[PDB]
Each structure stands twice: as structure tokens, then as C-alpha cells.
Short mmCIF file of C-alpha atoms in Angstrom, two decimals:
data_model
loop_
_atom_site.label_atom_id
_atom_site.label_comp_id
_atom_site.label_asym_id
_atom_site.label_seq_id
_atom_site.Cartn_x
_atom_site.Cartn_y
_atom_site.Cartn_z
CA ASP A 10 -20.85 -19.47 4.46
CA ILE A 11 -21.03 -17.02 7.40
CA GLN A 12 -21.38 -13.39 6.21
CA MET A 13 -19.69 -10.63 8.17
CA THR A 14 -21.02 -7.21 7.16
CA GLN A 15 -19.43 -4.11 8.67
CA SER A 16 -20.96 -0.69 9.27
CA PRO A 17 -19.99 1.74 7.97
CA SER A 18 -17.81 1.07 4.89
CA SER A 19 -16.08 4.47 5.26
CA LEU A 20 -15.95 6.91 8.16
CA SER A 21 -14.59 10.48 8.63
CA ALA A 22 -14.00 11.62 12.25
CA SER A 23 -12.01 14.31 14.11
CA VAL A 24 -8.89 13.71 16.25
CA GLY A 25 -9.91 12.98 19.84
CA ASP A 26 -13.32 11.66 18.78
CA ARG A 27 -14.81 8.45 19.99
CA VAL A 28 -15.20 6.25 16.89
CA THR A 29 -17.44 3.17 16.56
CA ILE A 30 -17.69 0.35 14.01
CA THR A 31 -20.20 -2.50 14.05
CA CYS A 32 -20.06 -5.97 12.52
CA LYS A 33 -23.07 -8.22 12.05
CA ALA A 34 -22.56 -11.99 11.78
CA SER A 35 -25.07 -13.86 9.60
CA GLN A 36 -25.06 -16.74 12.13
CA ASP A 37 -24.41 -17.18 15.83
CA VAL A 38 -20.58 -17.04 16.14
CA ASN A 39 -20.42 -16.70 19.97
CA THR A 40 -17.24 -14.75 20.84
CA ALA A 41 -15.17 -16.13 17.93
CA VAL A 42 -14.52 -12.74 16.40
CA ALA A 43 -11.26 -10.88 15.78
CA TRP A 44 -10.62 -7.25 14.78
CA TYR A 45 -7.69 -6.20 12.56
CA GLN A 46 -6.03 -2.86 11.70
CA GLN A 47 -4.23 -2.34 8.40
CA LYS A 48 -2.30 0.90 8.01
CA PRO A 49 -1.30 2.19 4.52
CA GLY A 50 1.46 -0.05 3.13
CA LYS A 51 1.62 -2.45 6.07
CA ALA A 52 0.39 -5.96 6.89
CA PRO A 53 -2.81 -6.26 8.93
CA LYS A 54 -2.28 -6.31 12.69
CA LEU A 55 -4.46 -8.12 15.22
CA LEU A 56 -6.06 -5.81 17.75
CA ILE A 57 -8.85 -7.84 19.40
CA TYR A 58 -9.68 -11.55 19.61
CA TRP A 59 -12.39 -13.58 21.35
CA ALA A 60 -14.54 -10.50 20.59
CA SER A 61 -13.08 -8.43 23.45
CA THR A 62 -9.65 -9.67 24.39
CA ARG A 63 -6.96 -7.15 23.54
CA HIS A 64 -3.90 -8.68 21.82
CA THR A 65 -0.58 -7.93 23.57
CA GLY A 66 0.98 -4.49 23.01
CA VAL A 67 -2.27 -2.99 21.71
CA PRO A 68 -3.16 0.50 23.02
CA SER A 69 -5.96 0.58 25.63
CA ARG A 70 -8.03 3.00 23.50
CA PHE A 71 -8.90 0.06 21.26
CA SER A 72 -11.62 -2.23 22.55
CA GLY A 73 -14.23 -4.69 21.35
CA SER A 74 -17.49 -6.12 22.67
CA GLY A 75 -20.42 -8.22 21.59
CA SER A 76 -21.58 -11.81 21.45
CA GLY A 77 -23.67 -14.07 19.22
CA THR A 78 -24.24 -11.93 16.11
CA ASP A 79 -23.53 -8.30 16.99
CA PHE A 80 -20.02 -6.92 17.48
CA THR A 81 -18.53 -3.53 18.22
CA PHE A 82 -15.07 -2.12 17.66
CA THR A 83 -14.26 1.10 19.52
CA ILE A 84 -11.58 3.77 19.54
CA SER A 85 -12.12 5.96 22.62
CA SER A 86 -10.02 8.93 21.46
CA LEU A 87 -9.02 8.94 17.79
CA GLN A 88 -5.31 9.65 17.23
CA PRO A 89 -3.60 10.79 13.96
CA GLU A 90 -1.77 7.44 13.60
CA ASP A 91 -5.10 5.52 13.75
CA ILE A 92 -5.63 6.10 10.03
CA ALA A 93 -6.20 2.63 8.61
CA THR A 94 -8.83 0.28 7.33
CA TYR A 95 -10.37 -1.96 9.99
CA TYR A 96 -11.57 -5.53 9.45
CA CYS A 97 -13.56 -7.98 11.54
CA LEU A 98 -13.08 -11.72 11.22
CA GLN A 99 -15.32 -14.68 12.04
CA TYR A 100 -13.43 -17.75 13.24
CA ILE A 101 -16.11 -20.12 14.54
CA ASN A 102 -16.25 -22.47 11.52
CA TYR A 103 -14.27 -22.97 8.33
CA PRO A 104 -14.06 -21.09 6.11
CA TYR A 105 -12.95 -18.16 8.31
CA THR A 106 -14.42 -14.96 6.80
CA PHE A 107 -13.58 -11.24 6.92
CA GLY A 108 -15.88 -8.24 6.92
CA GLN A 109 -15.39 -5.94 3.91
CA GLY A 110 -13.43 -3.41 5.99
CA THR A 111 -14.07 0.11 7.24
CA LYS A 112 -11.86 2.90 5.93
CA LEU A 113 -11.14 5.42 8.67
CA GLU A 114 -10.24 8.97 7.73
CA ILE A 115 -9.48 12.02 9.81
CA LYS A 116 -11.06 15.49 9.47
CA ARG A 117 -8.74 18.39 10.15
CA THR A 118 -8.54 22.07 9.24
CA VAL A 119 -8.06 23.16 5.64
CA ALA A 120 -4.46 23.17 4.46
CA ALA A 121 -3.32 24.61 1.17
CA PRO A 122 -1.00 22.61 -1.06
CA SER A 123 2.48 23.73 -1.89
CA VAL A 124 3.01 23.29 -5.64
CA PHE A 125 6.12 22.40 -7.65
CA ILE A 126 6.60 21.70 -11.31
CA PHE A 127 9.47 19.54 -12.66
CA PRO A 128 10.64 19.56 -16.31
CA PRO A 129 11.69 16.29 -17.93
CA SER A 130 15.39 15.38 -17.68
CA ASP A 131 17.87 15.41 -20.61
CA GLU A 132 18.36 11.76 -19.83
CA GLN A 133 14.70 10.87 -20.46
CA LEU A 134 14.55 13.05 -23.57
CA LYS A 135 17.14 10.67 -25.13
CA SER A 136 14.50 7.90 -25.19
CA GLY A 137 11.92 9.88 -27.14
CA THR A 138 9.51 10.53 -24.26
CA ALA A 139 8.99 13.47 -21.93
CA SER A 140 7.41 13.35 -18.47
CA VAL A 141 6.39 16.63 -16.85
CA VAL A 142 5.51 16.34 -13.16
CA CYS A 143 3.53 18.60 -10.84
CA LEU A 144 3.58 17.90 -7.08
CA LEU A 145 0.88 19.06 -4.67
CA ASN A 146 2.28 18.82 -1.21
CA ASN A 147 0.53 18.47 2.17
CA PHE A 148 -3.04 19.55 1.67
CA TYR A 149 -6.43 18.85 3.23
CA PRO A 150 -9.11 18.04 2.10
CA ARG A 151 -8.37 15.51 -0.59
CA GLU A 152 -10.35 17.15 -3.41
CA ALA A 153 -7.99 19.02 -5.73
CA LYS A 154 -7.98 19.98 -9.39
CA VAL A 155 -4.87 19.95 -11.56
CA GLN A 156 -4.96 21.33 -15.10
CA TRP A 157 -1.96 21.07 -17.46
CA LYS A 158 -1.38 23.60 -20.22
CA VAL A 159 1.24 23.52 -22.99
CA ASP A 160 1.55 26.89 -24.80
CA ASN A 161 -1.99 27.83 -23.63
CA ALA A 162 -3.53 24.50 -24.71
CA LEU A 163 -5.31 22.55 -21.97
CA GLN A 164 -3.94 18.96 -22.01
CA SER A 165 -6.47 16.23 -21.51
CA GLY A 166 -6.10 12.47 -21.76
CA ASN A 167 -2.31 12.51 -21.37
CA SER A 168 -1.81 12.76 -17.61
CA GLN A 169 -2.15 10.42 -14.60
CA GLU A 170 -2.28 11.29 -10.91
CA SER A 171 -1.42 9.35 -7.79
CA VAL A 172 -2.33 10.44 -4.26
CA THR A 173 -0.82 9.30 -0.98
CA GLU A 174 -2.81 8.06 1.97
CA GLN A 175 -3.40 10.50 4.80
CA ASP A 176 -0.20 11.24 6.74
CA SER A 177 -0.15 9.63 10.20
CA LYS A 178 0.98 12.90 11.83
CA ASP A 179 -0.55 15.97 10.13
CA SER A 180 -3.35 13.99 8.40
CA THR A 181 -2.63 15.74 5.05
CA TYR A 182 -2.54 14.28 1.51
CA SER A 183 0.02 14.70 -1.25
CA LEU A 184 -0.61 14.32 -5.02
CA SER A 185 1.55 13.92 -8.10
CA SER A 186 0.37 14.52 -11.64
CA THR A 187 2.58 13.32 -14.49
CA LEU A 188 2.04 14.68 -18.02
CA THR A 189 3.58 12.40 -20.64
CA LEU A 190 4.45 13.72 -24.13
CA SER A 191 6.50 12.50 -27.09
CA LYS A 192 9.93 14.16 -27.20
CA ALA A 193 9.08 15.77 -30.56
CA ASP A 194 5.88 17.29 -29.17
CA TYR A 195 7.79 18.54 -26.18
CA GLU A 196 10.48 20.19 -28.32
CA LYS A 197 7.80 21.97 -30.37
CA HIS A 198 6.52 24.02 -27.42
CA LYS A 199 7.78 26.61 -24.96
CA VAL A 200 5.48 27.17 -21.97
CA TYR A 201 4.65 24.26 -19.60
CA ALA A 202 2.37 24.94 -16.65
CA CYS A 203 0.26 23.17 -14.11
CA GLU A 204 -2.58 25.04 -12.49
CA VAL A 205 -3.90 23.93 -9.13
CA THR A 206 -7.36 24.67 -7.76
CA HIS A 207 -8.11 23.89 -4.09
CA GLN A 208 -10.27 25.03 -1.17
CA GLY A 209 -7.27 26.43 0.76
CA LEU A 210 -6.00 28.60 -2.08
CA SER A 211 -7.72 32.00 -2.47
CA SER A 212 -7.49 31.60 -6.26
CA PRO A 213 -5.77 29.01 -8.45
CA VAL A 214 -2.00 28.81 -8.30
CA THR A 215 0.13 28.23 -11.37
CA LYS A 216 3.65 26.89 -11.49
CA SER A 217 5.30 26.94 -14.90
CA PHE A 218 8.56 26.76 -16.79
CA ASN A 219 9.89 27.57 -20.25
CA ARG A 220 11.63 24.71 -22.03
CA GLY A 221 14.67 26.43 -23.53
CA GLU A 222 15.69 27.91 -20.17
CA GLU B 9 10.69 -10.64 18.74
CA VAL B 10 8.12 -12.77 16.86
CA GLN B 11 9.01 -12.94 13.16
CA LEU B 12 7.27 -14.32 10.07
CA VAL B 13 9.27 -13.87 6.87
CA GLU B 14 7.50 -14.73 3.60
CA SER B 15 9.35 -15.55 0.37
CA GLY B 16 8.79 -17.28 -2.97
CA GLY B 17 6.61 -14.60 -4.50
CA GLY B 18 6.99 -13.23 -8.00
CA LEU B 19 5.78 -13.29 -11.60
CA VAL B 20 4.24 -16.49 -12.95
CA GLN B 21 2.45 -17.61 -16.13
CA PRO B 22 -1.31 -18.35 -16.10
CA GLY B 23 -1.66 -22.07 -15.38
CA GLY B 24 1.74 -22.26 -13.75
CA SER B 25 2.80 -23.10 -10.22
CA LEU B 26 4.57 -21.42 -7.34
CA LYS B 27 5.49 -22.27 -3.75
CA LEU B 28 5.51 -19.72 -0.92
CA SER B 29 7.40 -20.10 2.37
CA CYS B 30 6.98 -18.59 5.76
CA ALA B 31 10.00 -18.66 8.03
CA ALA B 32 8.83 -18.39 11.63
CA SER B 33 10.84 -17.39 14.71
CA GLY B 34 10.19 -16.10 18.22
CA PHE B 35 7.56 -18.68 19.13
CA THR B 36 7.06 -22.36 19.85
CA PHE B 37 6.15 -23.18 16.25
CA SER B 38 4.76 -26.73 16.58
CA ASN B 39 1.94 -25.51 18.88
CA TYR B 40 0.54 -22.93 16.51
CA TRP B 41 -1.93 -23.15 13.65
CA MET B 42 -0.46 -21.43 10.58
CA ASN B 43 -2.75 -19.49 8.23
CA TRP B 44 -2.50 -17.90 4.79
CA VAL B 45 -4.51 -14.83 3.75
CA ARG B 46 -4.33 -12.79 0.53
CA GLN B 47 -5.25 -9.33 -0.65
CA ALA B 48 -5.56 -8.09 -4.20
CA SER B 49 -4.59 -4.45 -4.76
CA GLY B 50 -7.22 -2.07 -3.45
CA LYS B 51 -9.36 -4.98 -2.18
CA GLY B 52 -10.15 -6.67 1.13
CA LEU B 53 -8.59 -9.52 3.08
CA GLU B 54 -9.42 -13.04 1.94
CA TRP B 55 -8.60 -16.12 4.04
CA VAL B 56 -6.76 -18.76 2.06
CA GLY B 57 -6.43 -21.72 4.42
CA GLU B 58 -5.10 -23.05 7.72
CA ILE B 59 -2.98 -25.98 8.83
CA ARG B 60 -3.22 -27.31 12.37
CA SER B 61 -0.59 -28.71 14.75
CA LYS B 62 0.75 -32.30 14.73
CA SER B 63 -1.47 -33.22 17.69
CA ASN B 64 -4.32 -32.37 15.28
CA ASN B 65 -2.93 -34.69 12.56
CA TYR B 66 -1.78 -31.57 10.64
CA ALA B 67 -5.37 -31.19 9.48
CA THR B 68 -5.81 -28.64 6.70
CA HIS B 69 -8.74 -26.51 5.59
CA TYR B 70 -9.08 -24.26 2.53
CA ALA B 71 -11.14 -21.41 1.09
CA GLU B 72 -13.52 -22.64 -1.58
CA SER B 73 -11.83 -20.53 -4.29
CA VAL B 74 -8.52 -22.39 -3.97
CA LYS B 75 -9.32 -25.92 -2.76
CA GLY B 76 -7.84 -28.55 -5.05
CA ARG B 77 -5.30 -26.07 -6.40
CA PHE B 78 -3.51 -24.84 -3.28
CA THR B 79 -1.80 -27.11 -0.73
CA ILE B 80 -0.69 -25.88 2.70
CA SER B 81 2.08 -27.73 4.57
CA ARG B 82 4.54 -27.28 7.42
CA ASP B 83 7.96 -28.38 8.65
CA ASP B 84 8.20 -28.01 12.43
CA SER B 85 11.95 -28.80 12.43
CA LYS B 86 12.49 -25.84 10.11
CA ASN B 87 9.84 -23.65 11.79
CA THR B 88 8.46 -22.98 8.31
CA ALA B 89 5.01 -23.13 6.73
CA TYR B 90 4.33 -23.47 2.98
CA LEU B 91 1.73 -22.59 0.37
CA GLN B 92 2.09 -24.55 -2.87
CA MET B 93 -0.09 -23.03 -5.57
CA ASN B 94 -1.10 -24.94 -8.69
CA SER B 95 -3.11 -24.09 -11.79
CA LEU B 96 -2.68 -20.37 -11.21
CA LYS B 97 -5.32 -18.01 -12.53
CA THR B 98 -5.08 -14.26 -13.01
CA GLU B 99 -7.62 -13.82 -10.20
CA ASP B 100 -5.04 -15.31 -7.82
CA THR B 101 -2.89 -12.18 -8.22
CA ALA B 102 -2.44 -10.71 -4.75
CA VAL B 103 -0.21 -10.08 -1.81
CA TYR B 104 -0.11 -13.27 0.28
CA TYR B 105 0.29 -13.16 4.05
CA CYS B 106 1.37 -15.87 6.46
CA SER B 107 0.02 -15.93 10.06
CA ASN B 108 0.32 -17.91 13.31
CA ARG B 109 -3.15 -16.46 14.16
CA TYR B 110 -1.62 -13.74 16.35
CA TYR B 111 1.11 -12.16 14.16
CA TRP B 112 1.34 -11.65 10.39
CA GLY B 113 4.30 -11.43 8.04
CA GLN B 114 5.12 -8.57 5.66
CA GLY B 115 3.53 -10.42 2.73
CA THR B 116 4.71 -11.32 -0.75
CA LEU B 117 3.15 -10.37 -4.10
CA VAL B 118 2.22 -13.05 -6.55
CA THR B 119 1.51 -11.84 -10.07
CA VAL B 120 -0.22 -14.16 -12.50
CA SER B 121 0.31 -12.65 -15.93
CA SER B 122 1.75 -13.48 -19.32
CA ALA B 123 3.39 -10.03 -19.43
CA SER B 124 7.18 -9.83 -19.55
CA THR B 125 9.44 -8.65 -16.77
CA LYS B 126 10.80 -5.17 -17.38
CA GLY B 127 13.26 -3.06 -15.38
CA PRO B 128 12.55 0.63 -14.79
CA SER B 129 14.52 3.78 -15.71
CA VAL B 130 15.23 6.27 -12.90
CA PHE B 131 14.86 9.96 -13.82
CA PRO B 132 15.59 12.94 -11.63
CA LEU B 133 12.99 15.47 -10.48
CA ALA B 134 15.39 18.34 -9.95
CA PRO B 135 14.66 21.23 -7.53
CA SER B 136 14.25 24.73 -9.01
CA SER B 137 16.03 28.04 -8.33
CA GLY B 138 12.40 28.27 2.52
CA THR B 139 11.50 24.73 1.41
CA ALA B 140 12.67 22.99 -1.77
CA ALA B 141 11.18 19.86 -3.38
CA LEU B 142 12.97 17.21 -5.42
CA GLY B 143 12.41 13.59 -6.39
CA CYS B 144 12.90 10.55 -8.53
CA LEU B 145 10.68 9.27 -11.29
CA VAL B 146 10.70 5.49 -11.57
CA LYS B 147 9.30 4.80 -15.01
CA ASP B 148 8.11 1.82 -17.07
CA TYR B 149 8.47 -1.35 -15.01
CA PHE B 150 6.63 -4.64 -14.53
CA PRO B 151 5.59 -6.30 -12.37
CA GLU B 152 5.14 -4.54 -9.04
CA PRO B 153 6.79 -3.71 -6.72
CA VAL B 154 9.66 -1.23 -6.58
CA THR B 155 11.12 0.07 -3.36
CA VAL B 156 12.54 3.55 -2.96
CA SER B 157 14.52 5.02 -0.07
CA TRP B 158 16.56 8.23 0.33
CA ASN B 159 20.18 8.47 1.37
CA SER B 160 20.19 4.75 2.14
CA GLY B 161 17.43 5.29 4.68
CA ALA B 162 18.91 8.20 6.59
CA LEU B 163 16.43 10.69 5.14
CA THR B 164 12.74 9.98 5.93
CA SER B 165 10.92 13.13 7.10
CA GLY B 166 9.23 14.97 4.23
CA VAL B 167 9.43 11.87 1.99
CA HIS B 168 6.38 10.99 -0.06
CA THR B 169 6.55 7.85 -2.15
CA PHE B 170 3.45 7.71 -4.34
CA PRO B 171 1.35 4.64 -5.19
CA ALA B 172 2.44 3.28 -8.54
CA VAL B 173 0.13 4.01 -11.46
CA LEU B 174 -0.44 1.50 -14.26
CA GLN B 175 0.20 3.30 -17.55
CA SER B 176 -1.61 2.78 -20.90
CA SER B 177 1.40 0.64 -22.09
CA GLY B 178 0.69 -1.99 -19.38
CA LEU B 179 3.85 -0.76 -17.60
CA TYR B 180 3.89 0.83 -14.12
CA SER B 181 5.55 4.04 -12.95
CA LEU B 182 5.90 5.88 -9.61
CA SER B 183 7.43 9.04 -8.17
CA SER B 184 9.21 9.60 -4.89
CA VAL B 185 9.74 13.12 -3.64
CA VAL B 186 11.18 14.87 -0.63
CA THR B 187 10.95 18.44 0.61
CA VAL B 188 14.17 19.78 2.14
CA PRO B 189 15.70 23.13 3.30
CA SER B 190 16.50 25.40 0.29
CA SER B 191 19.80 26.31 2.03
CA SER B 192 20.97 22.63 1.95
CA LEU B 193 20.68 22.42 -1.89
CA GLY B 194 24.31 22.96 -2.88
CA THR B 195 25.71 21.25 0.22
CA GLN B 196 23.74 18.16 1.22
CA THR B 197 23.72 15.19 -1.19
CA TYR B 198 20.33 13.65 -2.13
CA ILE B 199 20.27 10.10 -3.52
CA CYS B 200 17.24 7.96 -4.16
CA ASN B 201 17.80 4.19 -3.72
CA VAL B 202 15.70 2.21 -6.22
CA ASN B 203 15.32 -1.57 -6.20
CA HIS B 204 13.23 -3.51 -8.76
CA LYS B 205 13.83 -7.06 -7.50
CA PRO B 206 11.80 -8.88 -10.24
CA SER B 207 14.18 -7.50 -12.90
CA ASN B 208 17.36 -7.53 -10.77
CA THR B 209 17.59 -3.75 -11.14
CA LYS B 210 19.24 -1.62 -8.46
CA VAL B 211 19.93 2.10 -9.00
CA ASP B 212 21.28 4.96 -6.82
CA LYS B 213 20.34 8.33 -8.31
CA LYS B 214 21.82 11.61 -7.20
CA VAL B 215 19.26 14.41 -7.67
CA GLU B 216 20.55 18.01 -7.67
CA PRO B 217 19.84 21.47 -9.15
CA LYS B 218 20.36 21.55 -12.94
#
């Protein structure tokens, strides 16, 4: 079974940079190599086949080269919409085999999140559960800390976060944290707050609300 | 102009069977070699198999992990390819893609689980009291996926639909938010369009200041 191993697994580069990814085939595979791009939420798209032929309607900044066992995928000038994972594929013999993919991320200047807190709805309170949500909107870099407090008590173990992929235009991330409580527990307290720590904020920022108001 | 439309995906018991279809248009179908590829969530692409043209005796080849369980077929008159999947295992859970080697379809999720189908509840994330943020919380559903749009698709800039998170209950949940002008809050209507096809659930939720 022909192994395709890509270098590197992850890569962070600046807009306008030349970016380079290599793929090593564990056997001679001549020019029977294809390169794919898979943007967040989309199906893979063929960029290059026969190692260096550009598929139709593919931007000129994408190119490939190589032969035998060593293959190169190149972006000449990295654009914001090029955020994706890239895969190489061997198609000389069955079974066709993919490289493990290279995740491409974009470096940009620091951007501070905008923060919003949302109380649970009356509707959800009917069902005996309460979800409090804190949104962190449009920030870079990805590292961010979100602490929940209910009447001064740090909440731990009762929240989950989800973070978007990098935006294809401004290259920022967004992040939601949802704090789930029983309705009884929720009714027993007044002050609900989420506190956000992040490189682009001079000191942590707290958004909060009082239940009975 | 070239189109590959997958269908047949959904929730299925361990051990069960399922048959996927790929409806092709925009190309001379009989000349192409149709391929299936799958991708588990957060993982890489994995080739499933390929069927060749009639002139090649419709020869078929398979990945080792599926051979003897999966059967690929075609119907040139229909311009459709098929993936019949037997003896399903939980490890087969993935989004399955159909390809003519040059273009790929949107893919269809196959979930191999003994868990029950459940429809979600849609809760508002109401904006406070100049940018405002609001959203919809889509809570407690199974299996994936749900789709969310805003104002039937007419509102897209500033929309962030988050990746679903699997909760402790074994049920999924996801939020969709949008940031809008504060001045449009008591004037412009905001409705999130939620579809949970596996449970036949469709909801339109107006979100507004409380």
C-alpha cells in the first residue's frame, strides 16, 4: 500500500506569502499525483492532476511539480480565501491513497474580540434547563480564555465552546461558550457573567446580566 | 455546469444496510470513472472505491476496509452511480462523496449508531439594550446535521454558524449568530431558518429584543 506523507501537517503564513507543501510517495508513482483543496464546510476540490496539470478554472497562483517520489504544491501569493486543508493523492495503483492533509492558516494582526452575553429564554426555562451563551466575535489569534461566574462562583465542568474556522476575508475567528444549568439552579442566582481574556484586550472584559431584570 | 448530487444518506443501525446515489449531469457520463471517498468528522479523506466505464467491463476496485461489504455500481442511462453498503459498522460513520475524478459532489452523512433520532428545539439569543449581536440556539438533536440560514438566505454578512458540539447527553447542539446595525433592531425583522432533515423538523424563529 503506497504511503503518501505530507510536510508539514499544519502551516501558518502571512497574506501575500509564497507557501510550499511537499508530499513524499513511498514508491515510484511517476506523475500520477493529484492535489486537492478543502475549504471549511465544503467538498474537496481538485486543483492539480498529473502532478502539474492545473484543473480548469483553478487560479494560476496554484501550481504543482515533481515526479517519481517527490511532489510539491505551491501557492505563489497567499490570499485570505486560501484558508483550507490541502491533500495530495496517489493514483498510480489501487488502492488510491491520500496524504494526511496540511492545514493552512493565516497570520494577521491582533484583533480584539467583541463580547456579548445572552440570557436563557423564557421558552427554554419551561423545559427545566437554562443555557447561558457568551459570544466572542472576530478576534485573532485563536487563543482565548472564557470564564463563567454565577454570583461570584467560577463555573467549571458545565460549559462547552465551539470556534469557527478562520474567516475567508478578515482571517478572524469567532467563539461561542454555552453554560448549561438546571432551571432551579438558575432561578436561585442573580448575577451571570462571562469574563474574556485575550491578547488584544488591555485587561479582561466582562459582560454580565442580572436574572430578574 | 457539471453537477453531482448525492442522496440516500442518514441514520442506520449497526449491522444494517444503506444505498447511496450520485446523480450526475453536465458531462458525458458513460466515459467517466466514478469514485467514492469518505471523511469522518475532523479526519482526512479516505478513498472508498472506483467503477470504470463499460468499455472496461465496468471493472470495480475497493479500499481494503470495505471490500466484501460495499458494492459500487452504475446506470449510464440514468447518469447515476451507486454505493450499496452492507454490514455497517460504527467506524463507517462519515460524509461520503461521489466523484467523476474531476468534480466532487456536496457529500452525504451516514451515521451508524443505535441512538434514536431526535428533533431540536430552537431558542432565541436576543440582542441587548453601533453593532448589535443576536442568534439562535439549536439544542438537543441527533444525528447531525442541521442547517441554519437567516431571512431565508437574504442575510449572510456577519453570520457565524458554529460547529455543533456533542453534549454529555449524547445529543448535539449549535448556535448561529449575526451582528447587525443597532439602529435596525426595532425595524428590520430577523428570522433564523432551521432544518433538521433526519427528524423532519423545520422551524422559522423570529429573534428580537425582549
